[PDB]
């Protein structure tokens, strides 16, 4: 048995979600989920370090930020998630949200992920489609945020001695730094 | 045996490279290799459509863009690649680089990939480190070009009807356009 399932009280699945987010952090080698408020990011295989710096963030989002949390479950197991934020965005304090998106027709989608062992199974499409329609039925337009510095090559090169020097056109040029490389 | 091999005549392993690159195309669901000029990218599992659009580029690059091509092999099997461009870069038709950065001190690293089956085994590091060293020796400062739009989330969302509306240094906001979807 499987399917989309709404979580009545998002905070009650924090532990299960925490572990799902860690497996993703490890599978993506520290790429996701994003840790904007973290100076030094923990090793992707370090769960304790991950939890210590992510648990507080999740606790807050599950309690206040998220207005609706949806998950894809298979036999009572969360293998996919997606959250909606639409209740008074102007007062949500969402760090990336500009004044232009602080209006009644704005709907935010976030916390969208899929268990790394269930990719290309149609789960992401089902979740996203459900989320887009849910927001629409609420008279809201769907918006999302993304972090380009997480692009695969840039991310790899960056932690390999390269530094950003230019980003003209649809490209981002990086340059190797000898002193930065050895700094590892 | 295994290790890094310098391909004397890059155009000789064109077919094997095509095969490897298609495996990457399929493994990254159409993300890599980048097909910028392509308005309508072929389905990630469509080898014929992939070749028709990518093979001509690869062919040109192997013969006219790359000055040096290195691979990492396990016997005759290519499982990693990396190329160097540092000779007369102002005359290779390169469009993904600024005119201000096309001097004799510039060295370009491209065609860097590793077979999806050999991740986290040190292959990538070995090749990159080799490339960087070789470039520095020739008195060239190594540079690479990346495509931010290929970021996992962006790429996925853009494929699902999302379009960019606002851009910031650390993030980019995307809005769903039903009328377009």
């Amino acid at each position: 048995m499987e399917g989309v399932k709404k979580i009545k009280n998002p905070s009650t699945v924090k532990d299960e979600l925490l572990e799902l987010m860690f497996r993703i952090y490890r599978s993506t080698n520290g790429k996701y989920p994003a840790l904007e408020w973290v100076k030094r990011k923990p090793n992707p295989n370090d769960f304790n370090g991950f939890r210590e710096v992510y648990e507080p963030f999740l606790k807050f989002r599950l309690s206040q930020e998220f207005d609706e949390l949806y998950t894809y479950q298979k036999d009572n197991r969360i293998i996919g998630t997606i959250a909606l934020v639409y209740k008074r965005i102007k007062e949500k304090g969402i760090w990336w949200v500009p004044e232009e998106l602080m209006n009644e027709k704005v709907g935010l989608i976030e916390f969208f992920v899929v268990d790394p062992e269930f990719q290309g199974k149609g789960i992401g499409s089902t979740l996203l489609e459900f989320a887009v329609k849910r927001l629409r039925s609420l008279g809201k337009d769907p918006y999302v945020v993304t972090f380009p510095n997480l692009e695969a090559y840039s991310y790899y090169y960056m932690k390999k001695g390269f530094r950003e020097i230019m980003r003209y056109k649809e490209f981002v040029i990086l340059k190797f730094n000898h002193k930065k490389f050895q700094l590892e």
Side-chain angles (χ1 to χ4, degrees), chain A:
Chain A
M1 287 179 62
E2 61 188 12
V4 177
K5 184 168 178 294
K6 189 174 189 294
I7 308 299
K8 187 174 180 184
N9 293 286
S11 71
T12 59
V13 294
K14 187 264 294 175
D15 296 323
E16 183 164 12
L17 287 171
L18 190 62
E19 183 158 28
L20 166 53
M21 295 304 262
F22 171 61
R23 289 176 55 250
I24 292 164
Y25 187 74
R26 185 178 61 195
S27 70
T28 64
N29 203 290
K31 205 125 66 191
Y32 307 108
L35 300 174
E36 184 73 3
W37 303 118
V38 185
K39 193 180 188 305
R40 48 284 292 284
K41 71 90 173 184
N43 185 83
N45 302 302
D46 177 14
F47 173 91
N48 301 316
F50 178 79
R51 189 175 97 68
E52 189 184 313
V53 80
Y54 183 85
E55 191 284 321
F57 185 57
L58 178 62
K59 191 172 183 179
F60 163 80
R61 302 183 107 192
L62 255 16
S63 297
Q64 315 289 153
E65 181 157 330
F66 298 167
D67 291 312
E68 298 187 0
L69 170 62
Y70 291 98
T71 65
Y72 189 93
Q73 299 188 192
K74 191 181 203 304
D75 295 340
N76 303 164
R77 221 92 307 178
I78 300 177
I79 59 180
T81 72
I82 198 166
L84 306 178
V85 175
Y86 60 84
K87 298 184 195 305
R88 253 84 302 296
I89 292 66
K90 186 186 292 187
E91 300 86 4
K92 283 287 187 177
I94 297 154
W95 75 272
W96 54 273
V97 176
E99 134 279 312
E100 293 105 314
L101 291 204
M102 297 177 189
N103 74 68
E104 196 66 43
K105 283 206 67 69
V106 175
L108 278 29
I109 284 174
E110 57 195 20
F111 203 69
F112 177 34
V113 92
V114 174
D115 189 305
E117 120 90 353
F118 289 85
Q119 294 175 47
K121 298 288 183 56
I123 300 171
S125 301
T126 292
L127 283 176
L128 192 54
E129 169 183 56
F130 184 95
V132 168
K133 272 170 189 163
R134 173 58 180 173
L135 284 178
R136 277 175 56 77
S137 73
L138 297 184
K140 313 290 183 169
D141 293 313
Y143 286 86
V144 290
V145 67
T146 68
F147 313 110
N149 84 281
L150 298 182
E151 183 276 325
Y153 278 88
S154 189
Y155 190 74
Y156 190 85
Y157 289 136
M158 207 67 92
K159 66 203 300 296
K160 234 61 179 180
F162 288 75
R163 278 198 165 297
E164 186 170 355
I165 304 302
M166 187 178 282
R167 54 277 190 293
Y168 101 123
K169 265 62 169 306
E170 311 198 311
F171 332 83
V172 176
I173 300 85
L174 310 168
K175 175 178 179 177
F176 176 73
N177 197 70
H178 189 45
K179 60 211 308 297
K180 159 60 64 175
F181 180 70
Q182 305 187 66
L183 195 65
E184 69 85 357

